[PDB]
Each structure stands twice: as C-alpha cells, then as structure tokens.
Design a binder for these strands. Structure first.
Length: 431
DNA sequence: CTACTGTGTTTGAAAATCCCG
DNA sequence: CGGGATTTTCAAAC
RNA sequence: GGUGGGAGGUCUGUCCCCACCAUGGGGUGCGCGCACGUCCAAACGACCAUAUCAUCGUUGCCCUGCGACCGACGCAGGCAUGAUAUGUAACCAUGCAUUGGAAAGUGCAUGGAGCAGAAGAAACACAGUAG
C-alpha cells in the first residue's frame, strides 16, 4: 500500500538552498550585476540599429537583432572592453544556449516586442533591467564531479560552481530521485558508473530576501527511438486502488472531492492582512523609497544635479576647476527602512510559502487517490464571469493549484480534463 | 508608487583555447 | 610545460 | 499557560532560542476548593536605550502659573500615548584576534545541525491586479 513507485522524468530541476560564504555570496551578486549590465547595454545598443549587434538588412531595409551573433566571442569581447565590471560573469552564462542573450533576450524580443523590426520598434515599450526587474539568475554548466553529496547526511550536497572556489553546501538534496538504467542507484553510484550527463545546467538565483538557491536540471538529451539520452527516476506514492474523482471548487474551501473529503484554505493573507497592512503603511512613511516624500526628493536632487552639471560643463568650458563641484548622490534608504522592508518580504514569502506547501500537500493527497481528474477549467477567466469567487480569488490563487495539479497528473500519466462534483465526474466519464 | 499574480516558453555536447602546480 | 577548468562553438532569424 | 517570531531546504507539532501578556473575570455541577468542556480579557515582524519631530485641540491630560470674555479662548511648561533615525533577536561545536587576571561575549573564518507526520519543478518572460 502506498508504494514508492519509480517514474521516468522527462526533465527536473533540483531546487535546493545554497549556503554560501559572505565573500562567495558577494562574488555571486557581482556576477548577477555583470549579467544585468550586459543585458542593459546590448539592448540599449540594438535600438541604434548597430550592425555590430544587429543582424543583416532585408529586401525592405528591415533589421532585427541577431542572437547567434550575440553568442559570438567578438561582441562579448567588445562588452568586456567597454567596461570591466562585466568581465565577471561566466561566458557559459552569456553565450551558451541558456545564456543571457540566447534565452532571456530571445523570449523578451519574441514576445514582449511582438517580433517586429528594431528600427520600427520603440524604446519605451522595452523593459530594461533595474531595481524593479533585476537579473537574479545565471545558468552555467558543470559536470557531475562537482556534485558530491555529503556521505553522512542524506540531504546535504556539495556543489562546485564555475568561477567559484569553495564547493557550495546545498541543503535539501532531493534523494527521492534515483539514477541508473532503472533508477536503482544513488548519486555516487551513477557518477562512478558514468550514467550522468557530462554537462548539467545549474541556475543560481537570489530571492527577494538575501537567499541564494540552485536548480540543477537533470534532463534527458534526445528521444532517439524509445530510449532517452539519459535516464533517472523518482519515487512517488499512489493509493493502492485508485478510483475516478471529480474535483470541485467552493467558496470557503481550497478543493472538494466527489468522495466527500474537503481541504480548507486557511486564508493565509487575511489572517496576516492586519500585520501586512500595518507594515505597508509603515514603510509608506520611512526614510526609504516607496514613500512619495523622498522618491520625489531624490528625483529632484538628480534634477538639479544634471542642471548644475550642464550649467558648469558647457558654459563653464570645464577648464580645470571651475567653481566647486558638489555631487552628493541619489541618497540611500536607511536601515530602519531596510529592516521592515526585509521583514515584510520575509512575511510575504512565508505566506506564499505556506500557500505553496499547503497546495503541494493537498495535490499530493489528491493525485494518488484520483486515477482520472475531472477539473472544470485550467484558466481563471472561465470562472470570473459570475464574480462570486472574486472575493475569495483576491487572497487565494487558483492558478498555482491548477498548475500543480496539471503537472503532477503527468508524472503518473493521469489524464486531465459534492453532488455537483459527482455529476461533473459522470459527465467527464460520458465524454 | 512598490509588491503580488495569471499565462506562455525552456530545460546541452564537444572541442579549442588557457593556465597554476 | 601540461591535464583540467574556463571559453567557445556548434547553428538559421518573421 | 497562551501570542508573535529565528536556524536546522518547505508546512504542523515538538526540540533549542528571542520579545511579550493571564495570574483575572464569568454559564452550571460536586465536595473555601476541584472544574469534567467551551466564554471574554490581554500580548502580534520585537525589545529597550539615545535625540528629534506630531498638531486641525491636536496626542489627551496634568490644568504649573499668566492675560482676557461671560461655561469658553490664547500664552509660557511636563506625562506617556506615535513615529523619524542609530547600538541592538532568535540551535550547537571548532579555529583566529579583541574585550576581561576570570566568567561570558564581541569581530572573522569554518564545521554540524534534528525528532514525530506530510510533501518537495525551478528559472525567465510578459501583462494585469492589490496595497
């Protein structure tokens, strides 16, 4: 009963939790920043139609940026020459197929800017990288020899990363996954038996709070015949005798089953709505940004800064020492702002994290019991017409639940399509 | 005015070049 | 001075 | 004993640890006490400490005196209410320097980190919404 049956994974991403050293964390942050500068400068230059970064002209004169050319060593060399602070990102994170230009920029231009020529396209529509949307990720390639799990502990890895010395300790090593021809090996067994891909992708990210993670993408190479290039398995639990289940959605519950069991969404927002709201108004009048009193203050300071620099540069001819230049800065938020900013970030990550874990648990207990899902809709726009659930949807996210159910019904290969729930299941059986 | 959410898209392999014991 | 680690190329374009 | 939280990848409880409030009052039993069970009260992203800022009667009072009207106005003072900044919170062990003749911390470098029950697909992009 409830046997841990192995499943063949099409892909994976071992989301773990790195514990870097202070200096190593600083280096990783510098790497994020260098990627940000690369993205900003390259896409700042693509709009001046620069053929050194843009592709070739057309029969009608149209030009798009070419991304096979941004993965050449020549433009990367030009970027390193322009500023050195960009030299710190790994070339595998910029030039390879999962890099800063062949993965981010490709989707960014192909969807955000609707795939239209770079001379007919605007600059205010493109969203650059800044504090609102920073670059908190990089995808480099390492061999399995840099993934050496801790011998004593069944949850501690030891990950070595490029340009990085120290072999990160990555807690949370998912040891529910087994490698080999039939998934009967540990990690060391497959590493020694040479059953692991020589170049595996890792994505170090830094979340809203200062917290560095990793996502190792165990992934089969090709689909030649019925045999993937590499194979690895995960063990999951299923009810001993599954039966068809028509899931139902209510007002005060997160999910209702046709059998009778119901899971209650404990409203993680409203219970902490008071503290979230008080912290929100708290930051609203602190020393930092998002204050409307010092945002305008620093915008002003920047305004007279550029005004005075213009007045001293050209009219003053900038000979040697004209007048007495004062530069100041855009000012920094004070720590008492940072402490409550981080506290609110921690609280809201904890709230969404409780939501995610609750949905994980509920989906796990509903996935095994159901051999055929009968959900109504995969989308939110097909249930907002009546607006009855909008009040519940304000604090409860149906999309996370729907996506989790959708992909977890695929691991068991379960096809996806109380009285009302039973009627829904009967209709699903009919069609 | 920041901060969170619904929806779509991805997810290497092998040489060639460089360099601290 | 040399195996291994870092970099580059694989490869087209609304 | 309850409330909020910090590390052990995530959730609950516990383990360790930090800041707080009840030692109360009430529906009914039995022998001044026992509550078999629920009820209300507190304490909510800290805590103090430091100096510097509310404003429309504000933050209300003390009304410490002062001036003037016929219960009400203004002037010079304080209280803790709130909010702006800084020294400042959350497991254990080792190694280096310092605080101390010690005890115990400080700053740095590491190392390790459950137990009980559940689960563990992440990154990017682009809209829109909440506050």
């Amino acid at each position: 009963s409830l046997n841990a049956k192995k499943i063949r994974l099409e892909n994976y991403a071992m989301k773990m939790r790195l514990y870097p050293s202070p200096t190593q964390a600083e280096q990783m942050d510098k790497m994020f920043l260098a990627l940000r500068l690369a993205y900003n400068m390259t896409f700042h230059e693509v709009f001046q139609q620069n053929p050194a970064v843009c592709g070739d002209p057309d029969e009608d004169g149209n030009v798009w940026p070419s991304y096979k050319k941004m993965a050449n060593k020549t433009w990367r060399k030009a970027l390193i020459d322009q500023n050195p602070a960009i030299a710190e990102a790994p070339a595998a994170a910029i030039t390879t197929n999962n890099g800063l230009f062949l993965s981010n920029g490709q989707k960014a231009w192909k969807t955000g800017m609707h795939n239209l020529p770079a001379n007919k396209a605007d600059r205010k529509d493109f969203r650059f990288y800044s504090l609102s949307k920073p670059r908190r990720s990089f995808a480099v390639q390492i061999p399995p020899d840099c993934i050496i799990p801790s011998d004593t502990n069944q949850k501690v890895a030891r990950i070595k990363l490029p340009k990085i010395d120290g072999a990160i300790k990555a807690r949370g090593f998912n040891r529910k996954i087994w490698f080999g021809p039939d998934g009967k090996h540990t990690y060391e067994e497959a590493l020694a038996a040479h059953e692991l891909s020589n170049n595996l992708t890792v994505r170090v990210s830094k979340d809203t709070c200062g917290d560095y993670f990793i996502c190792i993408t165990f992934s089969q190479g090709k689909v030649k015949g019925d045999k993937p290039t590499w194979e690895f398995y995960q063990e999951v639990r299923v009810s001993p005798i599954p039966e068809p289940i028509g899931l139902d959605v209510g007002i005060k519950d997160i999910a209702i089953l046709n059998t009778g069991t119901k899971y209650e969404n404990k409203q993680f927002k409203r219970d902490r709505a008071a503290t979230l709201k008080k912290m929100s108004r708290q930051l609203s009048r602190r020393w930092g940004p998002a204050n409307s009193a010092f945002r305008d203050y620093n915008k002003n300071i920047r305004a007279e800064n550029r005004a005075l620099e213009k007045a001293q540069q050209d009219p003053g001819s900038s000979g040697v020492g004209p007048e007495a230049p004062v530069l100041k800065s855009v000012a920094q938020p004070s720590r008492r702002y940072l402490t409550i900013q981080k506290n609110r970030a921690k609280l809201e990550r904890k709230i969404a994290r409780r939501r995610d874990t609750y949905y994980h648990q509920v989906t796990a207990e509903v996935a095994g019991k159901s051999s055929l899902l009968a959900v109504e809709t995969l989308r939110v726009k097909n249930m907002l017409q009546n607006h009855r659930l909008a009040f519940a949807l304000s604090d409860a996210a149906m999309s996370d639940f729907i996506s989790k159910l959708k992909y977890k019904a695929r691991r068991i290969q379960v096809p996806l399509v109380i009285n009302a729930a039973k009627n829904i299941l009967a209709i699903a059986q009919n069609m």
